[PDB]
Amino acid sequence: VPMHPFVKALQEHFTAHQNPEKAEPMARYMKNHFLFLGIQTPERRQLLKDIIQIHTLPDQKDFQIIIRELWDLPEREFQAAALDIMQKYKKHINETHIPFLEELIVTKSWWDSVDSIVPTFLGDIFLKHPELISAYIPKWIASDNIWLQRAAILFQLKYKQKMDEELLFWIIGQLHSSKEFFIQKAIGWVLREYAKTNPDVVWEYVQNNELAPLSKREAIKHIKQNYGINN
DNA sequence: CCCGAAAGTCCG
DNA sequence: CGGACTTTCGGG
Numbered sequence: 001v002p003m004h005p006f007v008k009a010l011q012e013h014f015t016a017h018q019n020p021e022k023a024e025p026m027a028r029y030m031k032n033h034f035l036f037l038g039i040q041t042p043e044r045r046q047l048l049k050d051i052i053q054i055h056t057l058p059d060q061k062d063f064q065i066i067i068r069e070l071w072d073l074p075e076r077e078f079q080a081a082a083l084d085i086m087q088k089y090k091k092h093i094n095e096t097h098i099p100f101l102e103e104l105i106v107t108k109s110w111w112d113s114v115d116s117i118v119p120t121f122l123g124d125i126f127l128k129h130p131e132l133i134s135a136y137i138p139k140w141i142a143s144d145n146i147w148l149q150r151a152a153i154l155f156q157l158k159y160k161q162k163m164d165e166e167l168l169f170w171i172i173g174q175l176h177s178s179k180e181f182f183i184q185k186a187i188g189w190v191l192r193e194y195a196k197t198n199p200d201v202v203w204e205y206v207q208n209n210e211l212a213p214l215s216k217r218e219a220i221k222h223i224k225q226n227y228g229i230n231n
Numbered sequence: 232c233c234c235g236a237a238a239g240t241c242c243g
Numbered sequence: 244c245g246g247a248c249t250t251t252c253g254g255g
Contacts, residue, residue: 029239029250041252115237189237213244222235232255239249 006058007069010051014039014077017047026076033110034076041080048081052088063089064100071108079108083116093121095129098136102148109147111182118150119157126155127162137167141174146182149175153186160197168194169205176211187211188218199223 002008014037023038030036039047058066063086070082086093101122105114126133140148152171156163172187195202203226206219 025250031239111237185237193236217245234253234255236252236254238251241248242246243244 004058004062004066004069006051006055006062007066007073009055010048010070010081011073011078013047013051014044014075014081017043030076030110030112034108035074037075037077039077044077044080045084048084057085057088060089060092063092067104071104076112079113083113086121090121093125095125095132098122098125098132101125102136105147105151106145109145114147114150115154118154122151122155123158127159130164133164133167137171141171146178146180149178149180149183150186153183153190157190157193159194163194163197165198165201169209172205172211173209176209176215178212181214184212184214185218187215191215191219192221195219195223199226203227 019038023036026036067082070078137152140152191202206216
């Protein structure tokens with residue numbers, strides 16, 4: 001079965017505009033986990049737009065197929081493009097897609113893909129269907145996969161006044177002992193972000209509960225100005 | 232334009 | 244450890 005023609009067209013068009021000179025530092029920035037073509041976001045977005053203009057966006061029946069096929073290509077720009085395409089199908093994504101999104105999180109995993117899946121796509125789903133959180137979050141925390149653990153921490157990132165504080169702090173308590181940078185930093189980020197909505201609750205939490213030094217320092221990067229640094 | 236964010240390197 | 248500094252990206 002041939003590659004979907006839309007994916008083949010995107011592959012051809014991106015490859016024709018590759019930049020091996022830029023690809024080297026781009027690959028180093030992601031710790032050489034991926035090959036890169038060397039195409040930065042503004043041009044990558046335009047090249048995708050070119051292909052949509054010529055071919056049209058595929059029928060929604062092929063949405064998941066297109067994403068998978070791009071996910072399977074070696075160069076990282078294809079995963080970035082896949083996420084751009086998934087946004088174009090946003091109004092068609094619902095709670096039945098949680099396993100599909102899980103599988104994206106745990107394949108070709110790094111912060112650049114996971115952070116573009118979790119607080120947006122998964123965040124929106126669990127905001128509408130909070131009763132499903134307990135069908136996934138406990139498994140994610142218990143798993144050996146750090147990207148699922150990060151997903152558990154960051155899916156509420158943008159919730160603001162809709163943050164479930166008890167849940168957030170429970171999740172952080174489960175993961176506070178992790179020695180993994182991407183977990184410590186995710187804890188820092190979600191606390192720093194939530195502190196923009198409720199600084200008193202974040203300050204009290206970090207002063208009275210154990211956290212890795214990195215997590216605490218990142219959490220209070222801004223709000224330490226509001227409370228002061230005691231001698 | 233601006234700022235804040237993931238990251239990243241380099242240094243003490 | 245954590246501060247100083249870097250580019251790239253998203254949003255105001």
